[PDB]
Amino acid sequence: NKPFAQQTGRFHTIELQEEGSPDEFQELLRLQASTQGHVDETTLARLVVQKRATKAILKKLLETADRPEEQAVWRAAIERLVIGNTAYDLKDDESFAKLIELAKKHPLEKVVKNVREVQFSEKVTLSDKYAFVPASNQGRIFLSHLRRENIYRTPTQRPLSLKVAEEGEGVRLKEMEEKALGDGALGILRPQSLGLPEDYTGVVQVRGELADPEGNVYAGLKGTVIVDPRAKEDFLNLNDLYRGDTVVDGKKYTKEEVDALIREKLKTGALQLNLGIHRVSTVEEAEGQYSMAASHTAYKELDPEIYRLLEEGVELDAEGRPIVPIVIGKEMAAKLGLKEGDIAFTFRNALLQARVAAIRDRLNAVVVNQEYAKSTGVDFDGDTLVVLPKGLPVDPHRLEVFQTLMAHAGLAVEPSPGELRFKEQLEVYDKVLARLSKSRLAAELRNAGVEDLSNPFEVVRQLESLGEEELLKAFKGYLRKGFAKELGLDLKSEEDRARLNQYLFEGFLDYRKQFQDPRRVYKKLPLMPSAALAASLLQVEAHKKEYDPSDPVALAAGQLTTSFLGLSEKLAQDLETSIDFPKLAEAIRAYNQAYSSGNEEQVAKARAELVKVLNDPTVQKFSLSNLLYQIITDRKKRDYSLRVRTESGKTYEYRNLYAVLNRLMQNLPVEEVADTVYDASGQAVEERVPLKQSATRSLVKGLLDLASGKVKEDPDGTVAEDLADLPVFGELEQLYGLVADAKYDPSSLKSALV
């Protein structure tokens, strides 16, 4: 309902972009289009984030001369401010006095127009949208800026307060494997303890913190919990909380160092958990219905049938479309007309075929194994799965297809077959089957309608399907004597005999209820040779780097550069209308076949065919489009870059993804907008970034005082044409101070700005 900053009180929040006012960053971004990609987006982003934030912090520092002890917290979001020639070290009671002095005597947009430098506190955490600063200086908040924005900017409803302790009544803090309850998941507590309607049974998405009476907060939490009355204690996994890795009072405290501090407070019974609910998992319609996704691993304890069910593999159907075990609720199973064993479909708000393996009375999640839906990138912090009925009015894609496209685009690589869930059992069965097929008993079976004896799950099914109890005792009795010999068990020894029925039935035959063909049910799904190929064709990857953690602009600057994820997505859709998915699919199926068991000529020819479909320009651009969308989405957290390795042998690094997106769009070569160029092994052959930066600060200065007449030149063929008639122009002028120092050769300005 409102930001967890405000529902908890930790931080004060000031907005960075005012009411409906124009996006000055979207405008600067067409300096990137005019220069054909030779300015630096994240520098443009910096100038904007420094302006927007300096203005906000002043305007607050003025509306807050009346609430004057609340002002003092905003004072220390800015250390030193250079306006004109005078410099204002706000820590001085002197300088600060003077700063608020001129603050009133001149209107805001003129004070900001003149700030030449600004340095922010370690205390202010800047983002694309807000400036957060902590409420009281008394305590200390042991998490990094990235995580404060992560945890505290989300809207949650009114925050609860739960006791943490190890013995007694409260919440307990186990120390298990990381992600042990699934990735986005960080705890299992009872519906009652966080105040939900009696015996709720689902998952709920929270934004909690872990604090003490004195105002120190040691870990913050972001993700979901699993609500369930069937579990005994309310417990949070500690290794899934965000703690440490930050600098309190000049020292970095590591994860490990803060984890020590918690165990010491926890023992003293002075450690709470302030938790805010953000969305409670209903089951609501979409046809189709959907709710949140839980990992089956968070059920080995409570309801281990669910755990063990989704643990025993996924089966590829006869056409290669994986069928994945899910577990749905009563409500859902109703409205969508499904019962145990029904094949449905599911996708995250790739479209996979689902096999219902269970139905529960009070469940309102959709519980899946995550390793088998990694192809729909399900994330157990809030992601929702949709289920559609058995009606199947669509074409669900093959494992090779998308697994091959996903790989061509750097988001998966070497051809491995799977791990068969039933490997050793099926070898035994094939040894026995040799003899069975020769026997009289096999003639009897084929006379009663069972022709193909190769699928034991089918022979047993098709039997009990049609009468034939005697032929079933005979088939079941045959395979006993068979496996017992095959495994050297003595069939008389009553504990050796219970070991057969343990191996043949309990471990093998009974799974005929979940799977259709044992020969196609996998423990580790395979990697099709076409996708290992597809990945060797494009050398595109998403290289990780953290935003400078010392400097609070880097992140907010970074988040502004995300603000065209729109165009990255239209590029994908507009692109995919072209690709003939028919021929893509056949060319892949050709290769994977001719790979597995094919002659030498075809493993040659199917290779050259698929390759020519994969090197097709519209395919390459489609896959490259898909990568960029992931990178841009991830730059909302880290300084990710694109890297590409070309026929030159060299690899190019990009963090100007808006120029990359334009070049892809207008079918221009993408290499000149690269930031750094590396030499095969050799690195740093060309570092283009420092040039691109001071160029940016020049062109901005140009664009600005060309549009305002301070340059006697023709603001006409240029991007300054009509700028000064536009609302956004009043905004851009508030960042003239930060680009004043720059210089530009006035002749070549008209050329740059066209």
Residue numbers in the entry: 327 to 612, 680 to 742, 750 to 812, 821 to 1162
From the paper:
Many bacterial and eukaryotic viruses with double-stranded DNA genomes in the realms Duplodnaviria and Varidnaviria encode homologs of cellular RNAPs (collectively denoted “two-barrel RNAPs”). The TMP-fused virion RNAP transcribes pre-early phage genes, including a gene that encodes another, non-virion RNAP, that transcribes early and some middle phage genes. Transcription by vRNAP and nvRNAP is directed by dissimilar AT-rich and GC-rich promoters, respectively, and the two phage RNAPs have distinct overall architectures, with the TMP-fused vRNAP being unusually flat and lacking the clamp domain.
Thus, the N-terminal part of the giant gp96 TMP protein appears to be a virion RNAP (vRNAP) that could be responsible for the transcription of the phage early genes. Several N-terminal fragments of gp96 containing the RNAP signature motif were cloned, purified, and tested for the ability to extend the RNA component of an RNA-DNA scaffold that mimics the conformation of nucleic acids within the transcription elongation complex of other RNAPs. While the shortest gp96 1050-residue fragment was inactive, 1200-, 1360- and 1540-residue fragments extended the primer. We crystallized the 1–1200 and 327–1124 fragments and determined their structures at 3.1 Å and 4.4 Å resolution, respectively. The structure of the 1–1200 fragment was largely the same as the structure of the 327–1124 fragment because most of the flanking regions not essential for the activity were disordered, except for two helices at the C-terminus (1125–1162). The overall architectures of gp96 vRNAP and gp64 nvRNAP are markedly different. In contrast, gp96 vRNAP contains no defined domain at the corresponding position, resulting in a clamp-less, flat structure that heretofore has not been observed for any RNAP. We hypothesize that this unique structure enables the passage of gp96 vRNAP through the narrow channel in the phage tail. Gp96 is exceptional as it lacks the C-terminal region, and its connector element, which is disordered in the gp96 crystals (gp96 613–679), is twice shorter than in QDE-1 and phi14:2. The disordered region is likely positioned close to the RNA-DNA hybrid duplex during transcription elongation and might dynamically interact with the nascent RNA strand, moving similarly to the clamp domains of other RNAPs.
